[PDB]
Amino acid sequence: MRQFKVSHPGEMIARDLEDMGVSGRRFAHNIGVTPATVSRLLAGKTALTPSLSIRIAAALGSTPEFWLRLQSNYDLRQLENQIDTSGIVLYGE
């Protein structure tokens, strides 16, 4: 089965910073983004974008692709109950 609870990657990052003894403000200065931007990311209020993924990977490790994949899977799980595609026609039938 799939994972029951899928978190927004910002929320995950927040726990990581905390485990690391790193403040969000300090994190923002290091990766070169505004503290307001990070604050929103950490609260899961805004998306982890491609350019953010390049900066985050530089700081937290892994690849930009990994971070973007966390976001896209999160976003798709979130939409699971909000899009009815049943009336859409699949071309080629």
Binding site: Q3, D19, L60, R69
Partner: protein
Amino acid sequence: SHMMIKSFKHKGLKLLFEKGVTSGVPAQDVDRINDRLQAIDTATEIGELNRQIYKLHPLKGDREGYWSITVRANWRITFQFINGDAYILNYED
């Protein structure tokens, strides 16, 4: 369907992953473990788990072929990793 967590040795992890049930893991580590399971599940190759905070390393004893990531202190999640798929997830030590 492909490149995800496929099986669990540790029943607590299985309950958390599949039903979000927290009773089978230490309460202070619930979110931390869920994040790490989300990472293992999302990663498509082992390098994507190589974040310094995870302390990613291959096991060497009889457990050769397995990998380890740190949750907290001496606690770890262990697993086999092939094809982007993760097998025999365990929480130990």
